[PDB]
Amino acid sequence: MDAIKKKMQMLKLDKENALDRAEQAEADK
Amino acid sequence: MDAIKKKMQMLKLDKENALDRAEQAEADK
Amino acid sequence: FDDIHRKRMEKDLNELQALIEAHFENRKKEEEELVSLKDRIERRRAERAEQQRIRNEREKER
Amino acid sequence: DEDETTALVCDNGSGLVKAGFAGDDAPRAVFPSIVGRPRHQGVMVGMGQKDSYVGDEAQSKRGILTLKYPIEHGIITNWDDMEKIWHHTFYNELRVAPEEHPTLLTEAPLNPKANREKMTQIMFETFNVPAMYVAIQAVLSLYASGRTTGIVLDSGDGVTHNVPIYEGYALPHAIMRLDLAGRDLTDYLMKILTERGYSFVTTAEREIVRDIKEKLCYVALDFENEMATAASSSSLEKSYELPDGQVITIGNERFRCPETLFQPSFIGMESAGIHETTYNSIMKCDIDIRKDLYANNVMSGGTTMYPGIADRMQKEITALAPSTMKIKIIAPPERKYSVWIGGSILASLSTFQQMWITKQEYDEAGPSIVHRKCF
Amino acid sequence: DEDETTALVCDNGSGLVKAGFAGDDAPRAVFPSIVGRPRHQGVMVGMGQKDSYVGDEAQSKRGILTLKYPIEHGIITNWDDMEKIWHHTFYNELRVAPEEHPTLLTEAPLNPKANREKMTQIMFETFNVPAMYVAIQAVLSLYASGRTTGIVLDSGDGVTHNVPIYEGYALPHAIMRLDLAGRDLTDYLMKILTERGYSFVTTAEREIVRDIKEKLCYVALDFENEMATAASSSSLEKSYELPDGQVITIGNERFRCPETLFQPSFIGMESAGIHETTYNSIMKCDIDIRKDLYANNVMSGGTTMYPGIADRMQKEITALAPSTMKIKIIAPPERKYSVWIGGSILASLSTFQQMWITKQEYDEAGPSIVHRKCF
C-alpha cells in the first residue's frame, strides 16, 4: 500500500536522519 | 496490518526519540 | 536500555522470517489444499449433477 | 487448576471484567460486567431457565432479558450481581477458587471508599479469600506502561481519572476526576443515530450501539475538517450490520460521538475536555515536576484506542503548553487491558507481599480495614 | 378568508392534526391524520367516489375504506398523504392559501432530521409558502402554560419525549425518549377486549377501540386496589355503545390499558414507565436546576386527559423524588391544546419574526436549513 511503504520509509528516514543529527549536533555541543 | 501496527509503533517511537535526541543535541548548546 | 531495542529487533526479525514463512506457507498450505480439495469437490458435484440430470431424464421416460 | 497460590487479578469495571492470574501478561478472559434477567412470562414447561444469567450467558440469551451492570461509573452497588460475576469469572473461566488464592481488585484514586470496603467484604465473607488488596488503577496503569512519573489518562467506560504521579508519589491536589466516559459515548451515539432515523432505546439496542461504537468510531486529529467532509460526502461513511440483518449507514456520527471527549458540551457536561484536564493536572504541579509529566501523558482504558486520540490530545496539550519543553503521549498497544496487566505486576512484586489484608486482620477489624491497609 | 397574513399553526401528529391561525387561542380545523382508500369493487356507476378521502371524509365514508395514518411515532412516513391532509386542512377548512401564510409545524427534540427537512420541503415546493418554521412541542407547551421552565410530558399518540427546558434553554442530555404512546395503549386495549370476547382488528374496529379508550379509560391513584374491585364486581364496569347499536361492557381493562404508562411491560416494552422518565429528565439536570423542574412538571398533548393522571404522576414522581422537595404538576384544562396555543404564541411573537426561514434562504440552502435556523 503506498501509505505504508512510503511512510514506513520516510519515518525510518526521519529516525536515521535524526539519529545522525543527534550524534552530529551532540559532537558540536 | 499487524505487521504495520507494530512497525508503526516502532518507527514512530524510534523516530520521535531520535528526533527528540536531534533537537536536544543541538538545543543543549 | 539499548538492549531493549536490540531485543525488539531480534524478536521482530525472528518473527519476520517466521512470518514471511508462516504468512506464505499457511496460505499455500491452506489455500492449495483448499482448492485441491474443492477442485475435487467441484468436479464431484458436477459429476453428480450430470448424473442426476441423466437420472431425471430416465425417470421422465419411465 | 493452578499449581501455585498465585494471586488472582481482576478489574471489575462498569464495562468489562478482566481476569487472569498474577504473573501473566494479559487477562486470560474478558467479558462484560453483566447480570441479565427475563422480562417475559414463561409458557413452556421443562425449559430449565435461570432467574438470572451472567456475563456471556447474559448476552447470549439477551433476546428476552433486561441487562444490568452492577458497577456504576466505577463503584459497586449491586454486590449480589457482582458475587455472581466473580463466581463466574473465577470458577467458569479461570477455574480457580479465591479460597485458595489471595485476590487483587482495583479502583481510581478518588473512587468513593464504599467501593473498596464492599469489594473487600464480599471476597472475604462469600468467597473466603485468604487475603485481599484493593489497588489503585492509576498505579497499575503506570506499572503496565513502564512509568514512575506521568499522567494517568484512564478514559474508559466508567470515569476519566486524570492523575499526576511523580517518582511513584501521588500529587493528589492536581487530580481532575471527570464525569466523561465511554458509557456516555454509547448513550450519546444512540441519540445521534436516532437523528439519522435509527432510534435506539432498549438494552438490545444499547448493546448494538456499543458494538457500532467499538467497531466504527474514531476521533480524528482535526475535528472540524473531518466533520466538514463527513457531513458533505458518502466517502467518509461506514456501514454496520445489525444482529437482525438491518443495515445502518453512519457518517459524521462516527466521530461526533467520540469527539465528546474533547467537547463534553455535546452531552451537556460542564467540561473543557480530556486534553484540558490533562493539561491542568500538570500545570497545578511544581515546575520541576511539569517537565517530566508533559513528556509522559500515559493512556490506559478504552476510548484511547480511537484513531487520532493520542495525536488529538497531544496537539491540544502542546497548544496549551509552553514552548521548548516537549509534550508527548504514551499510548501502548496494551491499551484498554493495561490496568489488568498492572495488577499482575503489582500482585507479583516481592515488595507487595506485605501489603495484603489477611483473613484474620479482616475479621478482627471488619471490611473498613481496607481503608487503612491498602493505601 | 382571513384578514391578516398571519402564520398558520398546524400541530400534525400520528393521531390528529390541530390547525388554525396564529394569534388566536384555539385551532379552527381539527382533523384526524387519516387518508382513506376504498377496499371494495364497485357495482353501481355514476356514484362519484374518490381515489382517496381525507380527514373527516376518511372517517365519514370509512365503512368501506381502509384507513391509514401518514405519521407514525412522531414522523411523516408518507409525505404525499400529508400533502393531501394539508391541502384539505388549509384550503377547504381553514380556507387559506399558505402562499401568504408562513405556517408553523411541530416536532419532538430528538425527532429524526429527515422529518424536519421533509416538512420544510413540502411547504416550500408544493404549497409555495413564503417562509417556514418547525417548532419544538415542549417550547410551545411551556408558552401556553405561562412558563420558561419545566418538564414537558408530551405523552401523545406517537412518542412520549420527556423533555426538560430551564430558563428557556434546552437541557438535551436529560431528554428521555420513550417508546410508549397513546397508539400502543389502543393496541393493548384491542388485545384485552379480545380476552373478553370482543376482538377488534379491522379499520372500523381500530377506530372504535381508540374511541372506547378516550371515553372509558382512566388511571386513578392506586392500580392494585382499583383492580381488586374491578375484577370482583360489576360496580366498576362501564358500557360503551358500538356503531351498530350493540354494546360492549368493559371492567378492569378500563384502567389496565393506561396503566401501561406506569407498567410498559404490558405491551412488551423495556421501561419503568412515564414517571421514571419524568424523574430522570429532572434528575439528570444539574442540582440547582432540579428544584425548578420538580416544581414545574408539565402535562401536554394527549393521554393527559386520563382521569387521575395529573395527580397520579405527581404521586409517582414524589415517590422517586427526595423528601422536603415540592413536586408539582401543571395540568390546566387547556391540556393537549397547549401545543397549538404555544404555536400561536410563538409564530406571532415579534421577537421571533427573524426565526422564520424565508423562501430565499430555503432555495439557496435546501430543506436541511430547518436544522440550522429553527433552534
Side-chain angles (χ1 to χ4, degrees):
Chain A
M1 173 63 205
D2 287 348
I4 69 173
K5 183 174 181 179
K6 291 180 184 180
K7 274 80 174 178
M8 187 176 294
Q9 292 179 340
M10 288 187 284
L11 274 283
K12 188 190 297 187
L13 290 169
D14 286 344
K15 184 257 286 182
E16 289 291 311
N17 292 337
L19 186 152
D20 288 348
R21 283 176 281 165
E23 292 176 355
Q24 186 278 321
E26 184 174 0
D28 289 347
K29 277 67 176 172
Chain B
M1 293 179 166
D2 54 348
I4 300 302
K5 184 176 179 179
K6 286 293 189 182
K7 290 176 185 182
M8 178 173 274
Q9 294 300 320
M10 290 166 71
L11 270 67
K12 288 179 178 177
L13 292 170
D14 290 342
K15 69 95 184 174
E16 187 63 20
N17 289 337
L19 183 58
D20 185 36
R21 288 192 295 273
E23 291 173 352
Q24 291 173 26
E26 196 279 327
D28 287 346
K29 303 298 181 179
Chain C
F1 178 75
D2 56 320
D3 55 305
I4 294 167
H5 182 62
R6 288 192 295 275
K7 289 172 189 176
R8 289 173 182 166
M9 290 303 294
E10 290 169 351
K11 75 180 177 65
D12 289 346
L13 297 177
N14 289 340
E15 182 63 14
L16 177 63
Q17 296 305 319
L19 295 174
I20 292 166
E21 179 181 355
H23 297 165
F24 168 66
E25 293 298 330
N26 290 341
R27 288 187 58 246
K28 185 161 179 170
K29 290 184 288 188
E30 190 273 333
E31 183 178 2
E32 291 296 304
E33 289 170 354
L34 181 62
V35 304
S36 180
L37 173 61
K38 300 292 190 177
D39 292 344
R40 290 192 299 278
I41 297 302
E42 180 278 331
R43 292 283 90 183
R44 299 291 83 74
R45 291 193 297 274
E47 289 169 352
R48 288 194 296 271
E50 181 62 18
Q51 291 167 350
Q52 186 61 43
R53 285 190 286 268
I54 290 167
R55 279 194 289 273
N56 288 340
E57 290 173 353
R58 290 173 180 166
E59 185 65 29
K60 289 175 189 296
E61 289 297 298
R62 286 191 286 269
Chain D
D1 290 337
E2 297 292 331
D3 57 349
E4 181 58 291
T5 58
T6 179
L8 302 177
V9 178
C10 183
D11 188 22
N12 57 326
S14 66
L16 302 174
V17 180
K18 298 186 283 276
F21 63 91
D24 204 350
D25 65 9
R28 299 305 298 175
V30 180
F31 67 92
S33 295
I34 300 171
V35 177
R37 292 180 173 84
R39 69 185 184 87
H40 289 270
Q41 173 67 55
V43 295
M44 298 186 74
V45 177
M47 296 293 103
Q49 303 302 309
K50 297 188 181 190
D51 56 304
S52 61
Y53 295 83
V54 59
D56 53 304
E57 293 177 341
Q59 290 181 317
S60 294
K61 301 299 188 185
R62 70 189 181 274
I64 57 169
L65 307 177
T66 182
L67 305 181
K68 303 294 184 183
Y69 291 80
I71 296 97
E72 299 178 13
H73 297 287
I75 59 170
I76 182 67
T77 61
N78 189 326
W79 73 266
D80 293 282
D81 288 355
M82 189 65 215
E83 183 181 0
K84 289 176 175 174
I85 292 168
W86 273 323
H87 184 270
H88 184 67
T89 300
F90 295 138
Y91 293 83
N92 295 331
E93 274 185 359
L94 297 183
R95 299 182 65 82
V96 300
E99 184 177 3
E100 297 179 1
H101 299 274
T103 299
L104 186 149
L105 302 173
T106 186
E107 65 177 11
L110 296 175
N111 190 296
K113 72 182 182 69
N115 185 61
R116 54 174 76 111
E117 291 179 351
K118 184 59 63 176
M119 289 188 294
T120 299
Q121 183 174 38
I122 300 307
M123 290 304 301
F124 281 115
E125 296 179 19
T126 65
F127 292 94
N128 296 311
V129 71
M132 290 293 291
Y133 187 83
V134 178
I136 298 169
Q137 287 170 322
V139 169
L140 300 184
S141 293
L142 295 181
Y143 282 133
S145 293
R147 297 291 184 275
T148 61
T149 301
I151 307 301
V152 177
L153 305 172
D154 57 347
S155 298
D157 197 76
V159 65
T160 300
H161 193 71
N162 300 306
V163 56
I165 300 172
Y166 182 85
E167 294 284 321
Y169 289 82
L171 303 172
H173 65 283
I175 296 169
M176 306 294 164
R177 183 122 110 59
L178 179 67
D179 291 339
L180 178 62
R183 177 58 62 181
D184 296 304
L185 294 176
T186 298
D187 288 342
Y188 184 68
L189 185 59
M190 291 170 75
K191 289 180 181 178
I192 65 174
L193 295 177
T194 300
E195 289 177 348
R196 287 177 69 84
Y198 292 75
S199 177
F200 296 90
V201 299
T202 68
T203 294
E205 289 172 338
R206 184 170 287 107
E207 292 296 308
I208 292 167
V209 173
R210 52 154 327 165
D211 190 55
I212 292 168
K213 184 185 83 188
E214 291 169 359
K215 290 178 166 60
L216 276 71
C217 288
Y218 65 97
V219 297
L221 181 56
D222 293 306
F223 173 73
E224 293 79 5
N225 290 344
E226 194 71 19
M227 179 186 72
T229 59
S232 298
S233 178
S234 66
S235 66
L236 277 80
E237 290 183 334
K238 178 71 184 80
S239 66
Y240 174 87
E241 182 178 71
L242 279 77
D244 63 351
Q246 291 183 69
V247 178
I248 185 167
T249 300
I250 301 172
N252 63 9
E253 298 84 3
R254 190 174 176 198
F255 49 95
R256 284 162 58 196
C257 189
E259 179 64 10
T260 301
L261 292 171
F262 296 96
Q263 301 185 57
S265 67
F266 290 179
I267 59 170
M269 179 64 202
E270 187 187 356
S271 174
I274 62 173
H275 58 282
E276 181 168 339
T277 58
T278 300
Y279 174 77
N280 286 332
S281 72
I282 297 167
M283 192 62 78
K284 296 295 186 181
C285 297
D286 293 356
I287 66 289
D288 287 321
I289 295 172
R290 293 179 193 172
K291 76 184 202 295
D292 297 293
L293 295 175
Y294 276 109
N296 296 280
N297 289 312
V298 180
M299 290 181 163
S300 179
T303 79
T304 63
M305 198 65 75
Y306 286 135
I309 195 69
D311 296 300
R312 184 57 210 279
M313 291 182 76
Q314 185 177 296
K315 179 179 174 183
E316 291 297 337
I317 294 165
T318 299
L320 295 171
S323 65
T324 301
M325 180 182 71
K326 303 295 184 180
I327 299 94
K328 183 177 181 183
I329 295 173
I330 310 303
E334 293 77 6
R335 317 232 264 293
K336 165 195 42 191
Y337 296 174
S338 66
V339 75
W340 181 90
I341 293 168
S344 181
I345 186 167
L346 179 57
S348 65
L349 296 177
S350 66
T351 58
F352 177 71
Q353 302 308 312
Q354 301 302 310
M355 293 299 293
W356 290 105
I357 300 166
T358 65
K359 191 176 191 298
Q360 180 64 48
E361 291 170 322
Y362 172 80
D363 290 305
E364 291 174 2
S368 66
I369 192 168
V370 70
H371 196 68
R372 303 300 184 193
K373 290 290 188 178
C374 293
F375 56 87
Chain E
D1 291 341
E2 182 59 285
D3 292 328
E4 181 59 293
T5 57
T6 182
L8 303 178
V9 179
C10 299
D11 185 7
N12 293 102
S14 69
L16 295 98
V17 180
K18 294 181 180 66
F21 293 79
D24 206 331
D25 293 323
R28 166 195 294 179
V30 179
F31 297 108
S33 295
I34 299 170
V35 180
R37 293 182 172 89
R39 69 185 185 87
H40 288 267
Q41 173 66 56
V43 296
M44 299 185 79
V45 66
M47 297 293 102
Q49 303 302 307
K50 297 180 180 178
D51 57 315
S52 63
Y53 296 79
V54 298
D56 55 312
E57 293 172 343
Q59 290 180 319
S60 292
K61 300 298 189 184
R62 70 188 181 274
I64 58 168
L65 306 178
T66 182
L67 301 182
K68 303 293 185 181
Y69 291 79
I71 298 169
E72 178 175 348
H73 297 297
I75 63 170
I76 298 168
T77 63
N78 186 337
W79 60 266
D80 190 70
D81 283 349
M82 287 305 300
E83 288 178 354
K84 292 180 177 66
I85 295 297
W86 275 326
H87 184 80
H88 179 68
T89 300
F90 295 153
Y91 289 90
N92 294 332
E93 192 69 23
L94 294 177
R95 301 185 68 79
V96 58
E99 184 175 358
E100 296 182 354
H101 297 256
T103 302
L104 182 149
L105 303 177
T106 63
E107 68 183 317
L110 300 174
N111 190 273
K113 183 178 177 183
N115 184 50
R116 59 183 50 162
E117 75 187 0
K118 185 59 63 176
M119 287 189 287
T120 299
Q121 182 172 43
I122 274 54
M123 290 304 298
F124 283 115
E125 297 181 30
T126 297
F127 294 99
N128 296 312
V129 75
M132 286 292 288
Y133 187 85
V134 180
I136 298 300
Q137 290 177 317
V139 168
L140 301 183
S141 296
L142 289 171
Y143 282 123
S145 294
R147 296 290 185 274
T148 59
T149 301
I151 305 300
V152 179
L153 305 177
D154 55 358
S155 298
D157 193 77
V159 63
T160 300
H161 215 72
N162 300 294
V163 42
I165 298 172
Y166 180 86
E167 293 285 313
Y169 302 73
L171 303 173
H173 66 281
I175 297 169
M176 300 296 108
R177 185 182 184 280
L178 174 65
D179 286 319
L180 175 62
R183 187 175 292 187
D184 295 297
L185 298 178
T186 300
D187 189 71
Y188 182 72
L189 183 59
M190 290 190 282
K191 288 180 170 63
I192 66 172
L193 294 178
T194 299
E195 290 175 354
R196 286 176 70 88
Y198 290 77
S199 174
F200 295 89
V201 298
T202 67
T203 293
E205 290 172 340
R206 290 193 298 274
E207 291 295 302
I208 291 167
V209 174
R210 179 174 63 80
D211 193 66
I212 291 168
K213 182 186 81 187
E214 290 170 356
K215 182 177 169 64
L216 276 72
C217 291
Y218 65 94
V219 297
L221 301 178
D222 185 325
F223 176 75
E224 292 77 9
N225 287 339
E226 193 69 18
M227 180 175 66
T229 60
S232 298
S233 178
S234 66
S235 66
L236 277 80
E237 290 183 336
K238 179 75 167 181
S239 297
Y240 176 89
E241 181 178 345
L242 301 170
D244 61 355
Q246 295 187 91
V247 300
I248 183 168
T249 300
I250 301 171
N252 65 10
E253 302 83 6
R254 190 174 175 199
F255 45 97
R256 285 160 61 193
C257 279
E259 185 65 18
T260 301
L261 292 172
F262 299 98
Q263 297 287 266
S265 67
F266 286 7
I267 60 167
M269 177 64 200
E270 188 191 359
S271 175
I274 63 170
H275 57 293
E276 187 71 21
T277 59
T278 300
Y279 179 71
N280 287 336
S281 293
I282 296 167
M283 183 184 76
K284 298 292 185 181
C285 296
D286 288 349
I287 193 164
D288 286 316
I289 295 172
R290 297 193 187 149
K291 74 185 200 296
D292 295 292
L293 295 175
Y294 277 118
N296 295 281
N297 182 2
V298 178
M299 304 298 284
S300 180
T303 77
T304 63
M305 292 177 72
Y306 283 115
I309 195 66
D311 291 290
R312 175 64 186 277
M313 287 294 280
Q314 188 173 292
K315 180 178 177 180
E316 290 293 358
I317 282 70
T318 298
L320 299 174
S323 65
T324 301
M325 179 60 71
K326 172 68 183 178
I327 297 89
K328 181 179 177 183
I329 293 175
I330 308 302
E334 283 174 11
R335 96 170 92 259
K336 104 212 226 189
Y337 297 89
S338 64
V339 173
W340 187 90
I341 292 166
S344 180
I345 292 167
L346 181 60
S348 66
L349 178 65
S350 65
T351 299
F352 187 76
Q353 296 304 305
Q354 73 281 358
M355 291 297 292
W356 286 99
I357 293 89
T358 64
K359 191 176 191 297
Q360 180 64 48
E361 291 172 310
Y362 172 78
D363 290 304
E364 292 174 2
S368 67
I369 192 168
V370 70
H371 192 71
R372 292 191 296 273
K373 293 290 189 178
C374 294
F375 51 85

